[PDB]
Design an enzyme around this catalytic site. Structure first.
Site, mmCIF file in Angstrom:
data_model
loop_
_atom_site.group_PDB
_atom_site.id
_atom_site.type_symbol
_atom_site.label_atom_id
_atom_site.label_comp_id
_atom_site.label_asym_id
_atom_site.label_seq_id
_atom_site.Cartn_x
_atom_site.Cartn_y
_atom_site.Cartn_z
ATOM 1 N N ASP A 197 0.868 -1.165 0.000
ATOM 2 C CA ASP A 197 0.000 0.000 0.000
ATOM 3 C C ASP A 197 0.908 1.218 0.000
ATOM 4 O O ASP A 197 1.524 1.545 1.007
ATOM 5 C CB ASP A 197 -0.941 -0.016 1.213
ATOM 6 C CG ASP A 197 -1.816 1.235 1.324
ATOM 7 O OD1 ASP A 197 -1.883 2.062 0.379
ATOM 8 O OD2 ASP A 197 -2.451 1.384 2.389
ATOM 9 N N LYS A 213 2.464 11.146 -4.056
ATOM 10 C CA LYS A 213 1.310 10.460 -4.633
ATOM 11 C C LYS A 213 0.357 11.450 -5.302
ATOM 12 O O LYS A 213 -0.376 11.088 -6.214
ATOM 13 C CB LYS A 213 0.574 9.662 -3.559
ATOM 14 C CG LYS A 213 -0.522 8.743 -4.090
ATOM 15 C CD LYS A 213 -1.001 7.819 -2.988
ATOM 16 C CE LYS A 213 -2.111 6.903 -3.471
ATOM 17 N NZ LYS A 213 -2.506 5.937 -2.407
ATOM 18 N N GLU A 248 -7.026 0.241 -4.559
ATOM 19 C CA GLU A 248 -7.012 0.152 -3.103
ATOM 20 C C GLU A 248 -8.326 -0.398 -2.548
ATOM 21 O O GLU A 248 -8.312 -1.286 -1.709
ATOM 22 C CB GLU A 248 -6.698 1.523 -2.502
ATOM 23 C CG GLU A 248 -5.255 1.943 -2.785
ATOM 24 C CD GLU A 248 -5.002 3.412 -2.580
ATOM 25 O OE1 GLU A 248 -3.972 3.900 -3.095
ATOM 26 O OE2 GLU A 248 -5.816 4.081 -1.906
ATOM 27 N N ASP A 267 -12.956 4.898 2.850
ATOM 28 C CA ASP A 267 -11.520 4.988 3.104
ATOM 29 C C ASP A 267 -11.137 6.389 3.551
ATOM 30 O O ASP A 267 -10.941 7.273 2.722
ATOM 31 C CB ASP A 267 -10.743 4.598 1.839
ATOM 32 C CG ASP A 267 -9.226 4.623 2.024
ATOM 33 O OD1 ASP A 267 -8.722 5.140 3.046
ATOM 34 O OD2 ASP A 267 -8.522 4.129 1.116
#
Ligand code: CL
Length: 372
Positions: A5, A65, A167, A190
């Protein structure tokens, strides 16, 4: 093969060995590792070492990211820039730092390859042998450029990327939702440290399809921390007629205390803050209730149900048509967050038996082993 992850603020690696997934602790016993890379006069720091000294703001890179796979022109990039203490440039964004006395420039995927290199060596310390195969995950809303650059980061780290997977898909896999037959609608909720994503997936005979993705790329646990810090900065002003805001160390120490208090308020209804000589030699011993915390974060809490409704709208599904609710990201531990989600779904159960910090790494490791 391992599952990684590669998160915005934190990364997590897991491995499926001996019928079970292990989420692997780094050197410091930490099972998640900050997605931070730092360059100094003498060395490159990654993860825990890097985030600590962030003293070196212009040369401590984070949030790669947010950049990866994007054009420099991308409004997202042009907007995130303004809150980064490090330089960005068109080459295509690159991060520019000073390293060992010289200016250096890295693509986002070069920065993320260093964080992946850390996750790789973390896995290898544990396994006692080299690791080359990996599954890396990305947000479902990532485009092909973002996925490719994420894969390239893995390659640069010396990995063979078996697959780039979503994810929310990894999270579903972690709960075995993909091996139950018929057809199943899954909502992944999430809420990470820095980002909030709602994904609805349909699983059909093991096959995944993203039906909808919504959220807020700038909403996470760190925002809840901020509410607490500002609250106590004000509480200190009221009580002592002083403003600690201009002292960097006081703010930091208050912030870590708030991070501790927020964690405590997930399992207790009150949390004590105790800081010796916070500012002007004044000790700051105070407390906050969960209720007070929830109130100060009222807007933030309300912000989470909106992407839920929009996700449902985009997927053309009703509440009752969701078979599974999955909690991902450490901040889903916040009771008010769970209640708001569960209430919205009429008291349904929440899939949360897996460490929400680790569910995605967990799922990527399961998938990695399947592909092997
Ligand atoms: Cl993320």
């Amino acid at each position: 093969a391992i599952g990684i992850d590669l998160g915005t603020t934190y990364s997590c690696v897991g491995v499926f060995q001996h019928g079970k997934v292990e989420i692997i602790a780094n050197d410091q016993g930490n099972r998640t590792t900050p997605s931070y890379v730092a360059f100094t006069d003498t060395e490159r720091l990654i993860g825990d070492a890097a985030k600590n000294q962030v003293l070196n703001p212009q040369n401590t890179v984070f949030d790669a990211k947010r950049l990866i796979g994007r054009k420099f022109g991308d409004p997202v990039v042009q907007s995130d820039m303004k809150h980064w203490p490090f330089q960005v440039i068109n080459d295509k964004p690159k991060v520019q730092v000073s390293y060992k006395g010289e200016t250096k420039a890295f693509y986002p995927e070069e920065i993320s390859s260093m964080v992946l290199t850390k996750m790789k060596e973390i896995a290898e310390a544990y396994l006692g042998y080299p690791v080359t195969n990996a599954v890396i995950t990305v947000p479902a809303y990532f485009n092909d450029s973002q996925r490719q650059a994420t894969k390239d980061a893995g390659v640069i780290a010396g990995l063979n990327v078996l697959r780039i997977i979503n994810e929310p898909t990894a999270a579903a896999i972690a709960y075995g939702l993909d091996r139950t037959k018929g057809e199943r609608n899954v909502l992944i909720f999430d809420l990470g440290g820095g980002t909030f994503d709602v994904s609805i997936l349909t699983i059909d005979d093991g096959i995944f399809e993203v039906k909808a993705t919504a959220g807020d790329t700038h909403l996470g646990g760190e925002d809840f921390d901020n509410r607490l810090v500002n609250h106590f900065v004000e509480e200190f002003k009221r009580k002592h007629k002083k403003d600690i805001s201009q002292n960097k160390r006081a703010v930091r120490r208050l912030r870590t205390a708030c991070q501790r208090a927020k964690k405590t308020l997930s399992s207790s209804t009150q949390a004590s803050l105790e800081i010796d000589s916070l500012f002007e030699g004044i000790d700051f011993y105070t407390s906050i209730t969960r209720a007070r915390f929830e109130e100060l974060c009222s807007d933030l809490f309300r912000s989470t149900l909106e992407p839920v409704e929009k996700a449902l709208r985009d997927a053309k599904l009703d509440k009752a048509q969701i078979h599974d609710l999955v909690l991902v990201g450490g901040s889903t531990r916040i009771p008010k967050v769970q209640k708001l989600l569960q209430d919205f779904f009429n008291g349904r159960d929440l899939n949360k038996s897996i460490n929400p910090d680790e569910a995605v790494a967990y799922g990527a490791a399961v998938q990695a082993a399947i592909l092997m």
